[PDB]
Amino acid sequence: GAMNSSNYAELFNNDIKLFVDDTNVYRVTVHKTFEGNVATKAINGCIFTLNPKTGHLFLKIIHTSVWAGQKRLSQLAKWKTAEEVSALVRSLPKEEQPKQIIVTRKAMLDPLEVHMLDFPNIAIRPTELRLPFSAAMSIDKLSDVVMKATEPQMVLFNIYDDWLDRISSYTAFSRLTLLLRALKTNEESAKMILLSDPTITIKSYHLWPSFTDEQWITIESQMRDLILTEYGRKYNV
Amino acid sequence: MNTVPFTSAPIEVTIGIDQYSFNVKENQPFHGIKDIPIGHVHVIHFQHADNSSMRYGYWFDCRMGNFYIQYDPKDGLYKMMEERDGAKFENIVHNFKERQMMVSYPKIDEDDTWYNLTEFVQMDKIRKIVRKDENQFSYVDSSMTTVQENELSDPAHSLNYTVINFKSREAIRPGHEMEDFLDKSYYLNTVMLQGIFKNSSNYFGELQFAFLNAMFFGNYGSSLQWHAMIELICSSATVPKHMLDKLDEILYYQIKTLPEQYSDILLNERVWNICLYSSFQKNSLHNTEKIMENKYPELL
Numbered sequence: 110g111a112m113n114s115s116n117y118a119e120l121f122n123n124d125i126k127l128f129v130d131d132t133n134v135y136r137v138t139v140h141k142t143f144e145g146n147v148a149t150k151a152i153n154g155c156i157f158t159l160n161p162k163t164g165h166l167f168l169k170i171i172h173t174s175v176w177a178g179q180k181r182l183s184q185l186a187k188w189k190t191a192e193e194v195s196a197l198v199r200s201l202p203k204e205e206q207p208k209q210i211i212v213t214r215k216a217m218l219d220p221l222e223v224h225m226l227d228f229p230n231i232a233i234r235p236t237e238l239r240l241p242f243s244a245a246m247s248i249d250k251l252s253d254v255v256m257k258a259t260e261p262q263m264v265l266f267n268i269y270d271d272w273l274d275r276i277s278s279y280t281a282f283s284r285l286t287l288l289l290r291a292l293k294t295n296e297e298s299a300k301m302i303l304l305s306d307p308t309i310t311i312k313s314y315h316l317w318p319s320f321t322d323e324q325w326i327t328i329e330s331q332m333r334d335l336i337l338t339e340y341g342r343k344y345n346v
Numbered sequence: 347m348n349t350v351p352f353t354s355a356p357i358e359v360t361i362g363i364d365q366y367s368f369n370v371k372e373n374q375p376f377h378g379i380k381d382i383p384i385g386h387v388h389v390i391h392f393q394h395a396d397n398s399s400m401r402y403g404y405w406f407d408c409r410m411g412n413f414y415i416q417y418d419p420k421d422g423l424y425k426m427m428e429e430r431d432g433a434k435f436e437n438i439v440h441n442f443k444e445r446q447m448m449v450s451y452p453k454i455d456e457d458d459t460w461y462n463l464t465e466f467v468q469m470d471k472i473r474k475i476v477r478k479d480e481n482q483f484s485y486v487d488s489s490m491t492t493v494q495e496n497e498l499s500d501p502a503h504s505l506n507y508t509v510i511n512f513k514s515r516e517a518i519r520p521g522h523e524m525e526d527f528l529d530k531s532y533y534l535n536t537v538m539l540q541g542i543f544k545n546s547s548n549y550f551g552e553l554q555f556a557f558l559n560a561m562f563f564g565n566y567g568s569s570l571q572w573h574a575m576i577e578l579i580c581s582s583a584t585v586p587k588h589m590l591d592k593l594d595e596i597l598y599y600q601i602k603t604l605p606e607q608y609s610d611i612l613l614n615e616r617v618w619n620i621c622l623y624s625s626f627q628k629n630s631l632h633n634t635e636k637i638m639e640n641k642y643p644e645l646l
């Protein structure tokens with residue numbers, strides 16, 4: 110059924126699975142028209158499809174031309190997401206196809222289920238976890254490739270950099286979700302933390318800085334303090 | 347005017363005939379039902395006084411043969427049987443008519459209710475949903491499951507309604523996933539009407555039969571089927587005008603006949619609210635929406 114805190118370790122077992130997050134597929138800026146009405150202008154988006162065990166990210170860039178002349182775009186965006194996820198699955202060798210696909214938003218269940226009718230043995234699951242994958246566009250290299258795209262495109266990343274050489278998937282996922290939650294709750298402070306020391310760089314082939322084990326403990330602590338602080342700055346505690 | 351004679355009534359039972367019902371006491375001199383209107387299917391149904399579990403009954407058409415009911419004390423139920431000796435049947439019924447041992451089908455002359463509930467129901471279609479080819483009449487009860495229920499377990503005892511599943515390859519053309527899910531017109535008009543049912547009259551007959559089994563036997567899978575057949579039409583943007591107008595009439599009389607007290611278990615809130623207030627056809631069911639709002643405003 111649904112994925113929650115009770116069945117959390119299932120993410121890191123040896124059954125291939127993918128998270129799908131559609132929160133950055135349809136993106137707009139709202140602005141005033143010359144006549145004083147309101148209008149939207151779409152910007153490029155992306156599907157965030159992630160294997161939590163391996164870190165493999167399948168970043169499908171959604172170019173604004175896919176909305177041209179379409180109506181009910183927020184509805185269409187869910188079906189476009191499911192069409193692209195289904196196309197991705199079909200493009201993978203059988204032994205690489207997922208056994209489960211977990212959507213971060215329940216409105217993706219029916220569109221994905223319908224697009225995956227041909228795959229009756231792939232389970233489509235929701236989750237009770239509040240995952241912070243909307244903040245994917247706060248990662249500079251992901252934001253950059255999305256905003257520069259001039260046509261539909263798929264780009265492949267490892268969102269864990271080389272962490273699995275030193276830590277387990279469980280710990281790597283915990284680090285990723287702490288970082289993203291921080292970027293989501295206070296992007297400015299989060300990014301200040303991650304870069305403050307210029308001697309630590311981001312490798313050309315990485316997304317995050319090259320911290321040592323000890324420096325990641327410091328960073329992780331600073332992200333917790335940030336999240337707790339905002340929680341207080343918000344509710345006043 | 348035809349007759350369903352009874353051998354006797356050895357156990358106390360509530361007997362239904364179509365939308366009417368009457369109580370018979372244990373060993374009461376009851377010998378059947380006369381004056382049954384020719385030209386419609388009918389249903390004769392039973393609820394034992396000592397065990398309200400298992401409503402059951404028989405769908406029949408008197409044009410197809412001479413049928414009588416005899417209690418079987420081994421299997422413990424009133425059974426329909428066909429009499430092949432037409433002289434015996436005439437003599438038996440006449441004997442009983444002269445002794446005034448039969449109740450009269452109590453139809454009010456102005457009252458078109460049964461016609462309106464069975465307008466498109468034919469015995470030949472009933473006997474393909476209820477498979478027992480050695481009999482001209484069809485047994486149904488509270489507990490029989492549908493072919494679709496059994497897929498999600500005795501096949502010989504199933505209700506073979508047409509399977510409708512909105513998230514199935516039958517319902518969804520490859521490459522038209524969003525279009526076909528959000529507008530079921532393809533599935534209604536091409537797959538079901540042209541493909542399976544051949545015409546809207548057979549579709550409506552099955553819909554009406556499913557409603558009657560839901561109402562008279564509390565058969566849960568029949569209620570599922572009735573609601574699925576309504577929802578498939580309401581969720582289609584392109585439906586022939588004559589079908590929409592007929593559906594409104596069909597549903598109006600189903601809602602009108604439903605016991606006011608069974609609406610909590612026989613009506614599906616989501617289906618009805620979707621059909622009357624959100625679907626493509628929200629503005630096409632004027633009579634049904636008016637009776638529903640005045641009779642069952644709580645559901646909505």
Ligand SMILES: Cc1cn[nH]c(=O)c1
Nearest residue numbers: 351352353414429438
């Ligand atoms: C009541 C009835 C009618 N016909 N044949 C029978 O044996 C019995």
